[model samples]
Target: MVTFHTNHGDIVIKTFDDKAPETVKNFLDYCREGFYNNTIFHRVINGFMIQGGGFEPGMKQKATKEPIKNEANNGLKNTRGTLAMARTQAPHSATAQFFINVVDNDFLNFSGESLQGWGYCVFAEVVDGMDVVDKIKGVATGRSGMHQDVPKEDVIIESVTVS
Candidate 1:
């Protein structure tokens, strides 16, 4: 288990280590190194998801290591409260960024082995503090720099720790 202390509130997540061992280990490595502390929930889209863990207070993206393998085929669903990796258009480009689904996003699930069919990897779920996630989803949002769905007021991630 891990507790993400956010400015809105604390969110406790139970990682699917058995189902997605590599993804879980990669996330835990960032947590153990305090890589998520002081990061902002840079993207929030109502009826979609809330993304964070890559940008600092000024929306400056933090340096990340080489991308990890795509684990979307792990048989995890992108249902509400599920935590998924945020990657680029490429299937295997996921790094430190992640998101918490605010709704049942079936379209984001793995459907086949092709590049277009490869979905985001979901390796955890919010076991507690879902209200905090809900709170974040309701915040006012707009464009920030070249990015859309950015929270108007910063939703800082104070810390993330194994609990």
Candidate 2:
């Protein structure tokens, strides 16, 4: 279990470590090092997802570890409130970035092992404080650099704890 203390509130999450082994380890590794502290929710979309854990204030990117394999085929679905890794067009490019699905995103689930079908890995879900997530989803957003859906006021992650 882990608790993300954010400006809105503490969002408690429980990881499916047994199902998505390496992904959970990767998430916890950042928690153990306090890497999420002071980070901001860099991207957010109402009725979609909220992404963070890889940027500071002012849209600054934080350096991250090498990408991990996609475990989306671990029988996990991208249901609402579940946490999934954020990757690029490449399948195995997830490192520290993650997102909380505000609504069910069935299309993001693994359909096959091909380049296009290799989906984002889901390793955790919010157990409490989803209201905080909803609150965040409703915040005002604008373009920041090339990225859109960025919150006008920073929604900071004050700290994180794993146990």
Candidate 3:
């Protein structure tokens, strides 16, 4: 298990390492190196998810190492309180960007053919401080370019550490 000490509170996450060993190890190494300190939640949809771990304040996208393979076949679902990697339209585009599901997001799951839409992969679960996740989900959001789902006040992730 690993813990995330946010500005709002703390979240203890139990990773599905058995199901997604490579993905879990990649994320753990990033956490151990404090790669997510002072990062901001760049994309947040109020009723959907709180996405972060790749950008700092000022909308700067953090430089990330090459992303691991898509472990979406690990059988984890995008249920409430689950932690998942947020990728672009490309399959191998995901690196450090991740999100915590505020509600059961069955829509994000890939049911269509491969290479169609972005398939977010769930690899962990928020086992503690759900109130913090809920609090984050309550933030205000508005249009940010064609994407109209950015939080008005940045929900900064102060730091993330492995425990």
Candidate 4:
């Protein structure tokens, strides 16, 4: 289990290593390295997912380790409160960025092994503090340079507590 102490509130997540082995290891590795501290939830698409873990305030992108393989085929769904690796259009390009689903996102699930079907890997679920996520999703957002959906007020991850 892990708890993200964000500016809004604490969000407790239960990670499933057995379900997404490599993805979990990568995330936990980042956690152990204090990689998420002071990072802002740069993206806030209401009714979708909130994305972060790769940027500091003022839209400064942090350096990350190599990308991990896509584990979306681990039979996990992108339902509400679930955590998934945030990647580019390339299936295996997920690195330090991650996102939390605020609603049921069935279309983000895996369907096959092809490029178009290799979905984002779901590695964890929010066991508590959905209300914090609720508060976050409702925050005012606007464009930040080339990025959109950036919170007008930063939704900062103050720290992370692992258990």
lDDT of 1 by residue, 1-163 (tens): 9999998999999999998888999999999999999999999999999999899988888999888998989989999999999999999899999999999999999988788899989999999999999999999999987999999899998998897
Regions more than 4 Å wrong, model 3: 144-147
How do all the candidates rank in terms of lDDT, highest first? Answer: 4, 2, 1, 3
lDDT of 2 by residue, 23-93 (tens): 99999999999999999999999999999998998888999988999998898999999999999999988
lDDT of 4 by residue, 74-137 (tens): 9899999999999999999999999999999999999999898998899999999999999999
Query: What's the best-to-worst order under TM-score?
Result: 4, 2, 1, 3
Taking all chains together, the TM-score of candidate 2 against the true structure is 0.98
TM-score of each: 0.98, 0.98, 0.90, 0.99
lDDT on C-alpha atoms for all candidate structures: 0.93, 0.94, 0.82, 0.95
The deviation in Å at residue 88 for candidate 4 is 0.7
lDDT of model 4 at position 53: 97
Each candidate's number of clashing pairs is 0, 0, 0, 0
Instruction: Candidate 4: give the clashing pairs.
Output: none
Worst 10 residues of 3 by lDDT: 110-119
True-structure RMSD for candidate 2: 0.6
The local lDDT score (0 to 100) that residue 114 gets in candidate 2 is 88
